[PDB]
Design a protein around this ligand. Structure first.
Ligand SMILES: *[C@@H]1O[C@H](CO)[C@@H](O)[C@H](O)[C@H]1NC(C)=O
Ligand SMILES: *[C@@H]1O[C@H](CO)[C@@H](O)[C@H](O)[C@H]1NC(C)=O
Ligand SMILES: *[C@@H]1O[C@H](CO)[C@@H](O)[C@H](O)[C@H]1NC(C)=O
Ligand SMILES: *[C@@H]1O[C@H](CO)[C@@H](O)[C@H](O)[C@H]1NC(C)=O
Length: 435
């Protein structure tokens, strides 16, 4: 179901419509040119930004879910049609940790990285950091495991030492961490994403609630419980087998039309939570953007947002010449980073009353952009076509054409043009508003 190259391709009419809880699916050639290395080009640097893999719900949501399943089982006088399974369903999900399927997605991601960049990766041990969350660290470890699986199988690799995770950045409201938001006080108090999500859920959940209630006489559901039962389709699917080879019984409770509403609900929460919809959302990605610019230009970091000046100024924790960098993060920071980088500056503000496809949204959606196991590659390449290095961004294998610079038909800008166009981030954006 899940493969190294394509990601997850089982039940795609449903499993690609779970927003950030979809398993990564490759978007190669989707509303995009090919991601292949263009003719007469050589990659000279690649930064990877990866989310952790498929996981259990957080302890908070896992509690909520289990409470709800228990109340259904306590309350229902019957379990009719497709709801019959709920009679005997045993809630066994954990909390926070990767599932075994999620571990394997990250090993696959490491294999794909080595294969895609084999020319470089044969001699390079990437410099790796993870945000200090156990599932993020564990994802980094499984990605290294995959990368080395591939590397040791290639008799042409010369530099075979395994990479370590060199920096684990603490997650704290008081620690400047560019791979997880937390310090920007005002933004942390924002309720906008949640209010947009609740207001949208109020539009679509009532029909589904009526229908679920009709099949579960005795039960009363809130619109929130509707969304919980939809969330359980992805969580149970990624936990119930090691290879996510069995779609959860929760999934068939809801129609394909309803899945496209759920998918949009998730795109809404991320856009108004962390993307350009939130007035401080892209500011959360400034720190990483200035770290990437330092890496792309081989120059010291210039930033006063969420970088830590101790960590960026020591080459042990922030080398400027490692050629391959891999950083592990979370969905919501990755959303803010991609928007800080201007990669979604063709996406107009999301309708809060109609579902717009990732195509009307210029390739933006939570499942296209921050699935479980999401990855972005930011490449520099030297092409016979040009003196200057050219930059390209790939998000889940979709070429996402750069904004703010003179972009070509392959989605590329010259490096210094790209960096000049990132003037908002380079100047610290509206980070002052945090305080
Ligand atoms: C910066 O990182 C140093 C090194 O671990 C740590 O002592 C300090 O508290 C961090 N400061 C902030 C604000 O993140
Ligand atoms: C939530 O409820 C109503 C829907 O009409 C709206 O006027 C209010 O502003 C909403 N909050 C947000 C952020 O949309
Ligand atoms: C942490 O970030 C704030 C800007 O948000 C800055 O005032 C402070 O100097 C930073 N501290 C470190 C150690 O980077
Ligand atoms: C993207 O649009 C925003 C909002 O207009 C602007 O602040 C930013 O500079 C643009 N980014 C790029 C890289 O063009």
């Amino acid at each position: 179901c899940d493969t190294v190259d394509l990601g997850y391709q089982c039940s795609p009419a449903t499993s690609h419509l779970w927003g950030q809880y979809s398993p990564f699916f490759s978007l190669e050639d989707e509303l995009s040119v090919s991601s292949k290395l263009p003719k007469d080009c050589r990659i000279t640097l690649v930064q990877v930004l990866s989310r952790h893999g498929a996981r259990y719900p957080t302890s908070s949501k896992s509690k909520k879910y289990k409470k709800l399943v228990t109340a259904i089982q306590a309350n229902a006088t019957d379990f009719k049609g497709k709801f019959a399974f709920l009679k005997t369903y045993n809630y066994t999900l954990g909390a926070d940790d990767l599932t075994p399927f999620g571990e394997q997605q990250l090993v696959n991601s490491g294999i794909k990285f080595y294969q895609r960049y084999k020319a470089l990766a044969r001699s390079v041990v990437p410099f790796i950091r993870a945000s200090g969350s156990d599932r993020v660290i564990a994802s980094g470890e499984k990605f290294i495991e995959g990368f080395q699986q591939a590397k040791l199988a290639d008799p042409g690799a010369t530099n075979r030492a395994a990479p370590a995770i060199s920096v684990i950045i603490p997650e704290s409201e008081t620690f400047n961490n560019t791979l997880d938001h937390g310090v920007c006080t005002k933004f942390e108090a924002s309720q906008l994403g949640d209010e947009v999500a609740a207001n949208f859920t109020a539009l679509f959940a009532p029909d589904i609630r009526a229908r679920a209630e009709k099949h579960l006489p005795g039960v009363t559901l809130t619109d929130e419980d509707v969304v919980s039962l939809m969330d359980m389709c992805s969580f149970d699917t990624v936990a119930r087998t090691s290879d996510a080879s069995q779609l959860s019984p929760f999934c068939q409770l809801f129609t394909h039309n309803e899945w496209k509403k759920y998918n949009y609900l998730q795109s809404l929460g991320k856009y108004y939570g962390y993307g350009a919809g939130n007035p401080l959302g892209p500011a959360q990605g400034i720190g990483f953007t200035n770290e990437l610019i330092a890496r792309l230009t081989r120059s010291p970091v210039q930033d006063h947002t969420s970088t830590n000046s101790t960590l960026v100024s020591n080459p042990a924790t922030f080398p400027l010449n490692a050629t391959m960098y891999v950083d592990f993060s979370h969905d919501n920071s990755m959303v803010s980073i991609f928007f800080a980088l201007g990669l979604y500056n063709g996406t107009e503000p999301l309708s809060r009353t109609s579902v717009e496809s990732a195509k009307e949204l210029d390739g933006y959606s939570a499942s296209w952009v921050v699935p479980f196991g999401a990855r972005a590659y930011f490449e520099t390449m030297q092409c016979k076509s040009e003196k200057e290095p050219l930059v390209r961004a790939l998000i889940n294998d979709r070429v996402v054409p750069l904004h703010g610079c003179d972009v070509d038909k392959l989605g590329r800008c010259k490096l210094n043009d790209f960096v000049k166009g990132l003037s908002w981030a380079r100047s610290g954006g509206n980070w002052g508003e945090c305080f």
